[PDB]
Amino acid sequence: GVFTFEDEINSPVAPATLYKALVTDADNVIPKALDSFKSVENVEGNGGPGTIKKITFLEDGETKFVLHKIESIDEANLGYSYSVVGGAALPDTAEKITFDSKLVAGPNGGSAGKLTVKYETKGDAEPNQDELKTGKAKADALFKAIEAYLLAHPDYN
């Protein structure tokens, strides 16, 4: 029915700069991180907590889009909550996926925080452990894109 996985996050980029560019520059990073960024628009919400944003990207010459929702923003603790409700990032065997990532300064000299992935299933149907791994690899694919941008663009604060 519902599965919850916890993962760790590590990045050589400052946690305060990555968090701001992650939620604050999220709409600005998505287009810069996605070389083929087509366009982005908000279907509902003004960008605050619970807002719904729609992003469009070009893949395999096919126009695709993704929908993301926010449950709450916590800049003070550098942490926020978001989940996908539409787009190719929405599996049919899973009702919806929630993502809870936090950001805290660490002694490593970079950014650190805990990541929590929530996988919901229609009901009896449930993805095997391997299938769940591919689901997480999809999200990590986006983080690396944003993280690679910060490392490739040191002028970004």
From Swiss-Prot:
Disulfide bonds: none annotated. Keywords: Allergen, Pathogenesis-related protein, Plant defense. The keyword Transit peptide does not apply. One of its GO terms (biological process) is defense response. GO terms for molecular function: abscisic acid binding; protein phosphatase inhibitor activity; signaling receptor activity. SMART domains: Bet_v_1 (SM01037). One of its GO terms (cellular component) is nucleus. The keyword Transmembrane does not apply. Expressed in hypocotyls and leaves. Induction: Induced by salicylate, methyl viologen, chitosan, hydrogen peroxide and sodium phosphate. Gene3D superfamilies: 3.30.530.20. Involved in disease resistance. Belongs to the BetVI family. This is Stress-induced protein SAM22. The gene is PR-10.
